[PDB]
């Protein structure tokens, strides 16, 4: 919804995201999947530099991503690490929404 919530939901200071614990919280509420970007927040903000009106943008560099993906048991997870580009909604020069991971 905004950059500060984007940070709370999609930035991780470690690749080794604690999926089973972090996903069963009120923040992630057992959602099927969440992508965490391994980075300090400020460099991620920079993906949207210069972009004002709401626009979905694919990163120009790949990033180190950590996905928590649900298993057969609701709210139980497997961690999957990958190196990939991803897309966000940019608005007023900041990511406000996570769109998805690149192909």
Look up residue 60 and give its two tokens. Answer: 């120009």
Active site residues: 10, 97
Task: Give the rounded distance of the alpha carbon of 5 from its chain centre.
Answer: 11
Look up residue 37 and give its two tokens. Answer: 């970007």
Query: Which DSSP letter does residue 19 get?
Result: H
For residues 14 and 35, what is the distance between their CA atoms, to the nearest angstrom? 13
What is the four-CA torsion angle of 29, 31, 35, 40, rounded to 10 degrees? -10
Query: By C-alpha distance, which of 101, 90, 31 is closest to 22?
Result: 31
20 appears as a binding residue in the annotation: no
Look up residue 8 and give its two tokens. Answer: 């709370």
CA angle 45, 50, 56 (to 5 degrees): 70
Q: Are strands 11-12 and 55-58 parallel, antiparallel or unpaired?
A: unpaired
How is domain 2-103 classified at the architecture level of CATH? Roll (3.10)
For residues 72 and 43, what is the distance between their CA atoms, to the nearest angstrom? 35
> How do the domains of the chain map onto residue ranges?
2-103
Please list the residues that pair with 95 across neighbouring strands.
90
What is the four-CA torsion angle of 12, 16, 17, 19, rounded to 10 degrees? 170
* Method of determination used here: X-ray
Look up residue 67 and give its two tokens. Answer: 């996905």
32 appears as a binding residue in the annotation: yes
Look up residue 36 and give its two tokens. Answer: 């965490």
85 appears as a binding residue in the annotation: no
């Amino acid at each position: 919804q905004d950059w500060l919530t984007f940070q709370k939901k999609h930035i991780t200071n470690t690749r080794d995201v604690d999926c089973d614990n972090i996903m069963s919280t009120n923040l992630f509420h057992c959602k099927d999947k969440n992508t965490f970007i391994y980075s300090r927040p400020e460099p991620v903000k920079a993906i949207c530099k210069g972009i004002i009106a709401s626009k979905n943008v694919l990163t120009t560099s790949e990033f180190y991503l950590s996905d928590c993906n649900v298993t057969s048991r609701p709210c139980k997870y497997k961690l999957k690490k990958s190196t990939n580009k991803f897309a966000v909604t940019c608005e007023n020069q900041a990511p406000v929404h996570f769109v998805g991971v690149g192909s």
